[PDB]
Amino acid sequence: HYPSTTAL
Amino acid sequence: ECHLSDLLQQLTSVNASKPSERGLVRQEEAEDPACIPIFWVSKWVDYSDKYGLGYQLCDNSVGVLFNDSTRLILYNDGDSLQYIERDGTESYLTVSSHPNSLMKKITLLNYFRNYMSEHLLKAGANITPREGDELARLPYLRTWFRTRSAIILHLSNGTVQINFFQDHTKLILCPLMAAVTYINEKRDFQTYRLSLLEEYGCCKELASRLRYARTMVDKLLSS
Numbered sequence: 526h527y528p529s530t531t532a533l
Numbered sequence: 534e535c536h537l538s539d540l541l542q543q544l545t546s547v548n549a550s551k552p553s554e555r556g557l558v559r560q561e562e563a564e565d566p567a568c569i570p571i572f573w574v575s576k577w578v579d580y581s582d583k584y585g586l587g588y589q590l591c592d593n594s595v596g597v598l599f600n601d602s603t604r605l606i607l608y609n610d611g612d613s614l615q616y617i618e619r620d621g622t623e624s625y626l627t628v629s630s631h632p633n634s635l636m637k638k639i640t641l642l643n644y645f646r647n648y649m650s651e652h653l654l655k656a657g658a659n660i661t662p663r664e665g666d667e668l669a670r671l672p673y674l675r676t677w678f679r680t681r682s683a684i685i686l687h688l689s690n691g692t693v694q695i696n697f698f699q700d701h702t703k704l705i706l707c708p709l710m711a712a713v714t715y716i717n718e719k720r721d722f723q724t725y726r727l728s729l730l731e732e733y734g735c736c737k738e739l740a741s742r743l744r745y746a747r748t749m750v751d752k753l754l755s756s
């Protein structure tokens with residue numbers, strides 16, 4: 526699975 | 534449908550003017566803050582191996598596009614629901630009610646909603662969206678695809694969003710306002726009218742992506 530931009 | 538063809542010909546028109554080769558380019562004169570989009574994907578997570586791709590609009594409203602081509606949207610009020618099947622029919626439920634047919638998809642709409650709220654960052658946090666109609670239902674995510682250089686999202690109200698993974702930049706093209714919003718590497722943004730870009734052109738950064746964004750529109754209509 527591939528998530529969008531992480532809080533950072 | 535007609536919106537994808539509408540968008541495609543708008544892109545061919547701006548790319549044919551060769552906007553980066555201008556004696557004096559004035560993209561400073563194509564701005565239109567009166568064209569900032571109403572909704573846009575600001576969070577998304579791809580779990581298509583198991584369930585599908587879940588996302589979040591600029592409002593906290595959460596939607597999921599499941600592998601079976603069905604769709605489930607949870608309004609930003611936390612309760613109202615909208616279910617759209619592969620064949621197009623819409624149904625309006627709530628979470629206070631207990632529709633047994635979907636209680637295995639509501640749990641997974643919740644898992645996506647918890648994950649995006651827990652780990653992922655809200656894109657366009659410094660943008661004031663433009664006001665929408667009073668009793669307007671949300672749009673759903675019609676079709677998406679994800680390559681190595683970028684991801685493409687196509688909402689049901691025509692808007693097509695493209696986030697470039699390497700540049701971190703993002704494009705939001707609206708065929709109705711005839712505008713595009715470019716999000717900078719520094720998270721700065723602006724909305725340019727598309728027909729104005731024909732007359733004044735734009736920088737290499739915006740011009741390059743408008744050319745790439747056309748071939749992506751061509752791949753949504755090739756399917």
